[PDB]
Amino acid sequence: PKTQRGIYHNLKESEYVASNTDVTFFFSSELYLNKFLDGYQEYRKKFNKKIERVAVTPWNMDMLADITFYSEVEKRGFHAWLKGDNATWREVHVYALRIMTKPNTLDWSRIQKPR
Amino acid sequence: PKTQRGIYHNLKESEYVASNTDVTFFFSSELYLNKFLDGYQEYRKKFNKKIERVAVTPWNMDMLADITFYSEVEKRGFHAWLKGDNATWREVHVYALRIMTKPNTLDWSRIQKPR
């Protein structure tokens, strides 16, 4: 359960969640949730510059950037859902691969605790 | 035709070719072909380290590294075949995107001019 300081050590029970309508990321605190939501757009830009210096490709790396920012922002674990079901780290990466072929990118917003 | 300096300005006519059995790259000179063959394994290691500094993924970036190294070595163009047929830059990247999910990596070797 949520600690006196507002922390969820078990991400599965967290009330702090963000979604892009396909994927849902769970956070251990409101501080981490807001850091992700407030910085992912800028991180996508920084991520692309770094990737492009390594290799030029026709791919949309936005989702991979989002997964990477989540891992960097959330310090108490990784917990995600894909299309409403609990997804493993690898399953989220598979989704990011398939998404690389599509031109448009889905944005993220805070949602209420799911079922 | 091959110039007096051993150069092929039209890559499709080149006798300097390398293949990994799925993809074939054409070179404008023996110097470039050998530069590719002599350094692609080492470039893969370098490439992978650069990518990982940007993002950790479960993918095999070898083919992407190979495409990137070929683009760096061959100074007179890009000309490739995919499964025995002419393949555009985009089609080769599509192949690299797919092969990313396989742990094994095909090596490259010089071959006799095909077809």
UniProtKB/Swiss-Prot annotation, chains A, B:
Question: Which Pfam family, any one of them, does this sequence belong to?
Answer: Phi-29_GP4
| Biological role | Mediates, together with protein p6, the early to late transcriptional switch by stabilizing the binding of host RNA polymerase (RNAP) to the late A3 promoter. Activates transcription from the late A3 promoter and represses the main early promoters A2b and A2c by modifying the topology of the sequences encompassing early promoters A2c and A2b and late promoter A3 in a hairpin. Proteins p6 and p4 bind cooperatively to an approximately 200 bp DNA region located between the late A3 and the early A2c promoters.
**Annotated DNA-binding ranges?**
76-95
Record's subunit section: Interacts with host RNA polymerase (via C-terminus). Interacts with DNA; binds to the A2b, A2c and A3 promoters. Interacts (via C-terminus) with the histone-like protein p6.
Give the UniProt keywords, A-Z.
Activator, DNA-binding, Early protein, Repressor, Sigma factor, Transcription, Transcription regulation
Q: Does the keyword Repeat apply?
A: no
The name under which this protein is listed is Late genes activator p4
> Which Gene Ontology BP annotations are present?
regulation of DNA-templated transcription
A GO term for molecular function: sigma factor activity
* Stated family: Belongs to the phi29likevirus late genes activator p4 family.
The record lists the organism as: Bacillus phage phi29
Q: What is the top-level taxon of the source organism?
A: Viruses
Q: Does the keyword DNA-binding apply?
A: yes
